[PDB]
Amino acid sequence: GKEVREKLVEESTLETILKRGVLKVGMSTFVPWAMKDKEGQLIGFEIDVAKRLARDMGVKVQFVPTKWSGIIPALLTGKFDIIIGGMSIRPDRNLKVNFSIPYDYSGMSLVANKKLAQGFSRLEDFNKSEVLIAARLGTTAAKAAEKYFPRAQLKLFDDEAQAIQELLNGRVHAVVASAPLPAFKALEYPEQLFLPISGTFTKEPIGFAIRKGDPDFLNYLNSWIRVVEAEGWLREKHHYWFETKNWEHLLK
Amino acid sequence: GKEVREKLVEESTLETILKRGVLKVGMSTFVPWAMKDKEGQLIGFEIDVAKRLARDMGVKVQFVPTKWSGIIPALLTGKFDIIIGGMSIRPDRNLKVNFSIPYDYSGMSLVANKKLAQGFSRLEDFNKSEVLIAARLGTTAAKAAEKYFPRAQLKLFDDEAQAIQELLNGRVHAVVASAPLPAFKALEYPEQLFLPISGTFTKEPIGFAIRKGDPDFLNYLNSWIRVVEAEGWLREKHHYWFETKNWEHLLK
Amino acid sequence: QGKEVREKLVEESTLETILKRGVLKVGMSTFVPWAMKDKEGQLIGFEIDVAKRLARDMGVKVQFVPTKWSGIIPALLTGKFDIIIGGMSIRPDRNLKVNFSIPYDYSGMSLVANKKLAQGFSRLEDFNKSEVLIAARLGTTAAKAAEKYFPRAQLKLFDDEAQAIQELLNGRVHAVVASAPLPAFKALEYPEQLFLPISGTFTKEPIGFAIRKGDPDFLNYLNSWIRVVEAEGWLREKHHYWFETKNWEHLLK
Ligand SMILES: N[C@@H](Cc1c[nH]c2ccccc12)C(=O)O
Ligand SMILES: N[C@@H](Cc1c[nH]c2ccccc12)C(=O)O
Numbered sequence: 001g002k003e004v005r006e007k008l009v010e011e012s013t014l015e016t017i018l019k020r021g022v023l024k025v026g027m028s029t030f031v032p033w034a035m036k037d038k039e040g041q042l043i044g045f046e047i048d049v050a051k052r053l054a055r056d057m058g059v060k061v062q063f064v065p066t067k068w069s070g071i072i073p074a075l076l077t078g079k080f081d082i083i084i085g086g087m088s089i090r091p092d093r094n095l096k097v098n099f100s101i102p103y104d105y106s107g108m109s110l111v112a113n114k115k116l117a118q119g120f121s122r123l124e125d126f127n128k129s130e131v132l133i134a135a136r137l138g139t140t141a142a143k144a145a146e147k148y149f150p151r152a153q154l155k156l157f158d159d160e161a162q163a164i165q166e167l168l169n170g171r172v173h174a175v176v177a178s179a180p181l182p183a184f185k186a187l188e189y190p191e192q193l194f195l196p197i198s199g200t201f202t203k204e205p206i207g208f209a210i211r212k213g214d215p216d217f218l219n220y221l222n223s224w225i226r227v228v229e230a231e232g233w234l235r236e237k238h239h240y241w242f243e244t245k246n247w248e249h250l251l252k
Numbered sequence: 253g254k255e256v257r258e259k260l261v262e263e264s265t266l267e268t269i270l271k272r273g274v275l276k277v278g279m280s281t282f283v284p285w286a287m288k289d290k291e292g293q294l295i296g297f298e299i300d301v302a303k304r305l306a307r308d309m310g311v312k313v314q315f316v317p318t319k320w321s322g323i324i325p326a327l328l329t330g331k332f333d334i335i336i337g338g339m340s341i342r343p344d345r346n347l348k349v350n351f352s353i354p355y356d357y358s359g360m361s362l363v364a365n366k367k368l369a370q371g372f373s374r375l376e377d378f379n380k381s382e383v384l385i386a387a388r389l390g391t392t393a394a395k396a397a398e399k400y401f402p403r404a405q406l407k408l409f410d411d412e413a414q415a416i417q418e419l420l421n422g423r424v425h426a427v428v429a430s431a432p433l434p435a436f437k438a439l440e441y442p443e444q445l446f447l448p449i450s451g452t453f454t455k456e457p458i459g460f461a462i463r464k465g466d467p468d469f470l471n472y473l474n475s476w477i478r479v480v481e482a483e484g485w486l487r488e489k490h491h492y493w494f495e496t497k498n499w500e501h502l503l504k
Numbered sequence: 505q506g507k508e509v510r511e512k513l514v515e516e517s518t519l520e521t522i523l524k525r526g527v528l529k530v531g532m533s534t535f536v537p538w539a540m541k542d543k544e545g546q547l548i549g550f551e552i553d554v555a556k557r558l559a560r561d562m563g564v565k566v567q568f569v570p571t572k573w574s575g576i577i578p579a580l581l582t583g584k585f586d587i588i589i590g591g592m593s594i595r596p597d598r599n600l601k602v603n604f605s606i607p608y609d610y611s612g613m614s615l616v617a618n619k620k621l622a623q624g625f626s627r628l629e630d631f632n633k634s635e636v637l638i639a640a641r642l643g644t645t646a647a648k649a650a651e652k653y654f655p656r657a658q659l660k661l662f663d664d665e666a667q668a669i670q671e672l673l674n675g676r677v678h679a680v681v682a683s684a685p686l687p688a689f690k691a692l693e694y695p696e697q698l699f700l701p702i703s704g705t706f707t708k709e710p711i712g713f714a715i716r717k718g719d720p721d722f723l724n725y726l727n728s729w730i731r732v733v734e735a736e737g738w739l740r741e742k743h744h745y746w747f748e749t750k751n752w753e754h755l756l757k
């Protein structure tokens with residue numbers, strides 16, 4: 001009279017984590033979401049979120065850096081328990097994984113090369129056949145480039161630094177990427193780069209991704225988000241990482 | 253040692269939809285939530301919601317128009333996968349079906365007959381035993397009439413146009429219905445009708461209804477709502493259908 | 505057939521257990537004005553009102569199972585009742601064993617101090633000192649808060665609230681830490697001995713129902729119910745009545 005329900009509880013990935021004593025977290029490099037610093041340790045907003053979640057669960061944390069384009073297959077094949085990697089909740093991804101409630105929000109922005117894109121002042125100036133746009137492979141930045149600049153030539157990169165180097169070198173007109181990356185890079189490299197428009201042109205809820213059939217793990221993650229949101233801690237961390245450069249000299 | 257969990261995933265109605273290639277949606281006629289255009293094809297706020305959801309799942313959409321009084325039994329016996337019908341989340345209904353998070357909010361309003369309700373300037377003027385009120389059978393409008401005008405005689409109709417026609421004919425004092433229907437009809441027929449009070453006297457979250465034991469389908473629907481809400485799409489659609497009459501030329 | 509596991513999960517929900525019994529069994533503990541016995545001998549308060557409307561909207565009777573707070577989660581786990589509706593803060597350590605609804609209320613921590621021992625105190629830091637003795641209820645988030653915000657002070661955990669106040673009045677502790685509005689009530693009650701050194705609250709804690717795990721249908725029902733009564737304004741009206749007025753005072757005496 002209770003077997004099915006008890007078996008569902010036992011098979012939760014939350015129970016797998018508790019038995020192992022370690023939360024295994026899949027993520028990828030996006031500055032300042034997650035990145036290796038000069039001491040060789042991972043830091044960033046997503047790292048702070050994952051480290052606190054592990055601590056509040058009473059377990060150790062282990063990070064499993066993964067190629068972003070293969071991060072969902074890695075979750076599905078059990079390379080880790082959870083994606084904490086600044087993943088936008090999306091209905092195509094949700095076919096394969098389940099999402100928590102949002103713990104952050106992001107929006108898409110654009111940074112441009114001063115010589116190639118001189119005089120460009122509007123989104124539509126980049127939606128032309130002769131314009132080359134760079135974005136990160138497998139991300140919502142690529143999807144936004146296709147949606148808002150469909151006539152542009154889109155060039156995808158599996159590495160964030162390789163994409164910005166193309167822009168610095170004058171090989172593409174713009175990089176499309178989540179704020180605050182475009183604004184930060186325009187301020188970092190004013191000799192080569194500029195920010196044509198302030199603000200953002202998408203609004204994207206960010207959630208944890210976990211494997212399906214696990215309502216108990218979802219309950220735990222959503223309850224955890226609600227508590228640290230009400231505490232003001234997510235706002236504090238969002239401001240530190242995305243609205244200051246106080247962490248800048250931790251990096252190589 | 254994970255059969256129960258793997259079987260729950262396989263038995264989700266989300267997987268049933270994906271393998272069929274078609275989302276089957278139950279709904280009923282309420283202008284402008286869902287109604288036939290002059291070609292005989294369905295249009296409205298709820299139709300647009302269902303069409304986007306199906307498209308974002310990668311499937312076709314098939315509408316199953318249903319008598320509202322039997323729409324939950326139809327869901328339970330498998331006539332369709334989901335109710336996208338402007339349904340208020342309610343605890344009695346929740347005994348039989350599960351509800352998504354809200355994708356819309358509505359509120360109750362009243363439109364009155366000028367001759368029978370001459371002088372009725374307040375809501376309490378309609379809470380009298382000599383007053384007759386019409387409402388749609390099986391809706392929260394019928395419940396609202398029972399709660400806020402318990403002394404009045406309630407006349408129920410399974411057809412929206414039949415109810416407003418009784419009001420137009422001077423056979424009832426008022427129709428209780430979700431905004432914007434009362435305001436729209438008072439502006440459409442000022443010779444017969446008037447709106448004694450602006451604004452609404454209920455506030456009702458609107459949710460999808462699906463069959464129980466399906467946490468995976470619930471996760472998908474709620475994550476979808478969060479994405480299209482943040483995009484501003486639900487707001488745009490709510491404004492077009494419920495705050496303008498720009499769609500009237502599609503009807504007749 | 506082909507839906508066996510799913511149909512069994514539906515049938516094994518505690519929601520169905522409640523509907524078949526015809527009665528909702530609610531675990532709670534006595535905290536004024538969350539839940540308390542009035543002078544007619546009946547339970548009243550914010551949590552009682554929430555539980556009574558939930559039961560009525562479910563179509564069942566309600567039965568309250570008063571339980572000692574430190575043992576309330578073990579009592580839920582062993583089936584002494586169906587649900588905790590007892591002002592319980594959603595917390596990650598508790599969530600290891602039970603599941604939580606979305607929030608139906610929020611609380612924040614406060615503090616009530618002895619006038620003689622804590623004369624001149626006016627900030628949180630004044631109480632964070634080795635000589636300061638602080639009391640908090642065992643097993644509550646007041647104990648966690650005292651540990652976090654007053655780590656240097658000597659912490660006296662208790663489970664007899666009346667005895668803790670007796671010690672605060674005779675000056676055997678400097679302050680009592682507890683969820684607002686209770687410290688303010690104790691201060692506004694005994695203005696000669698006690699006072700309220702800090703205005704407002706220094707935590708923000710979402711409050712949720714707690715239920716046994718593996719029950720996504722019961723969670724859906726509880727969360728949908730909260731959404732409806734929150735939209736109606738009813739929860740905020742009940743929060744105001746119990747926690748921001750004393751209109752209920754003379755039901756007690
Ligand atoms: N949210 C993006 C990933 C992302 C995070 N930070 C970024 C910065 C730039 C480009 C992409 C990103 C996605 O889900 O696909
Ligand atoms: N929300 C109502 C249905 C509804 C939508 N639009 C309406 C207009 C008039 C009356 C009822 C309705 C319900 O759940 O019952």
Ligand SMILES: N[C@@H](Cc1c[nH]c2ccccc12)C(=O)O
Pocket residue numbers: 535538590591592593594611641643644645646682683686
């Ligand atoms: N929210 C507290 C319980 C509580 C409610 N009201 C209180 C008043 C005093 C002390 C504790 C409480 C907890 O979960 O631990």
